[model samples]
Target: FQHMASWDIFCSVGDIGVTWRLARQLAAEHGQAVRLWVDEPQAFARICPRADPVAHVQCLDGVEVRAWGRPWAPVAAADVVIEAFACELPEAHRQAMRERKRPSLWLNLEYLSAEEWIGSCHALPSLQACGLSKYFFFPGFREPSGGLLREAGLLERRRRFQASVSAQDEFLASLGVRRKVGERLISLFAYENPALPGWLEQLRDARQPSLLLVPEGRVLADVADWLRVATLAVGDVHVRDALRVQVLPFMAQDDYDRLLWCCDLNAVRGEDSFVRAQWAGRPLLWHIYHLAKLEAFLELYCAGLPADLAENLRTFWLAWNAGGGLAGAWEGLERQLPEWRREAQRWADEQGMRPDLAARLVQFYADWLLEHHHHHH
Candidate 1:
């Protein structure tokens, strides 16, 4: 690292290339040792193509990428160890940590949530692995839980983006996607669910044009059935005046970001993509992944927000949960989009002033690492 002494980060590399890139930036900007413990970089790159699997270049945004087929002993000297998404750490690395005279400060990072408990437990420390104490880092919607995965210039970038529409055409053209003279446009990225048909049928009588874009992955079979086509080729286009359907390949992360930006609205699944839509400053709908019959997680997940937002979102989401497609809610939700954009901008402004989750994590690490640095040093 340019100015800082040293830093170390460890993850399975089973998935999540974006976070690794972000971690790379962390080490460089702060002048510290940055390491990525990846078991399967090749597999990681498949879901997010922008990542490079090889190379431990000193200046990859100033971070180090270490391929971990076997555990390396240097890990014992790490100032910070991040256990990403509950994945188990390598045994060698654990032995390294345990051997340290002062012991390593392990961080067990969790995913984003809007739940109430997250705020209370955000940075709470837990004693795991015999004597190792790990901090839980939660990316959340409220003041607590380290907030969202913000960056120094994210808000400015978003503001700069929202002020113009130049990128819109470029995005569509890249996908070979074109809007009919008068048709609705929708961006769809989701898991296979039974709600797809009801959604399309709901749009049958909509006065405006309707366009559905399917990311080339899950739901392909369903999409084929919906479009009455054998398959959806990348450049293939179908039209019905009131609706247009286009097939696009699973996108790179940056391109996925742009896809959300260019759409009239986005139907997304998962916490990560769902959060991205919020940053796109667009009105969003999150499938939030399916859970067991227990609604506790759902209830806890959406707790402590503005009553208005919680209400509208609840109704909208409840319908989706109830097998109702977006068709019925589309017109109303579309009408709400303008207002929602304004609200998202306000929320984003708040997030901009607040430090990102990583920075906060680093700050917390610094305090803990300092008291315990001598043990390893």
Candidate 2:
């Protein structure tokens, strides 16, 4: 049978980003026929504008993009069905899977996490009332868990881009950013936080020059408030002391990756950008949405760091999330950049050594198919 998979990903852009990347990887790397069903087609279109949301079903990059709740492909035709982030499948689709001659390999792709429980729960199956078993696939940091989302050749491409100063300059210029010599470049794409005003003030008063590039996001409102303006638009620049804050237009996924690579530091919020920042191999600050999970990750990330460096990172991350005490934390972090950069690259390289999520999913499907065939005989 042909390797055919259908993914149901809905709501947030974070989910869509992960689902779309997996779908693309399955198609391009594994030669699987993949279909993606999204609830908000327009939201999907924002990242990939070439996919015509109005078309209902359109093929892009070897994957079929379909509007959720619409009649598209038959469930019986799929060899694997992925319900991303526990977004349940439609009743009709569930029924179709149960009634099929051979049950499809169903997997619920869970969120990215570093907690210890993930290994035990990674591929555990839940027997459903519909008589099909649904497996849990957790994207995580290490073995026995489905790994993180990483496209093939992503690191190689990033290394090449970083090696060429002209390419970095050209990409930045396209975004209306012209970097000055000896100026540190930082990119911020985060949710609105109370800590922002004070943090910007710290940057403004720093002895070294800083150019803060902020993409238009939820945090723009807070930024405008700091600048005492009604709104901040694309190409808006606000200067004070040694810092220059420039507002950039929202970028597509590829362009955003380049932005992360070009920056000396990145402030990212939520899963997708947070993961991308790590792949950029630059020192980063995360504005977390979870406390325990954030601590778990910090433990793993700060494992081999020097005492002072680790403390600075932990202090800065905690302060960033807690919405206070950023000035001293930022100062300490800036003082350790030389060592921090090496550690960041080392961490990214170490993570890259493991199997990626798409490859793990494909292998799991293969193993399940073999076991099912053996049991039937």
Using lDDT as the measure, which candidate wins?
Answer: 2
For model 1, give the 10-residue run with minimal summed lDDT: 289-298
Q: Could you tell me how far off, in angstroms, the CA of residue 213 lies in candidate 2 after the best superposition?
A: 0.8
lDDT value, candidate 1, whole model: 0.66
Best by TM-score: 2
Which pairs of residues clash in candidate 1, taking residues 3 or more apart in a chain or in different chains?
4-31, 6-33, 7-33, 183-209, 184-209, 184-210, 184-211
The sequence of per-residue lDDT tens digits that candidate 1 reaches over residues 1-377 is 23363455666642365466457557645556777666677765565455577743223455566666654444455766787778787777777777877677787777666556777887788887577788888776667777666556666776676566566766678788876665656787777778877667656556777888886776767877877888777767777546677888768766787788777678887656776776777666666654332143446433544555555665667666666555545556555656666665665565566677767777877677665656442
Return the lDDT, model 1, position 47.
54
Query: TM-scores, in order shown?
Result: 0.83, 0.94
Task: Quantify all predictions' global Cα lDDT against the true fold.
Answer: 0.66, 0.85
Quick one: how many clashes does candidate 2 have?
A: 0
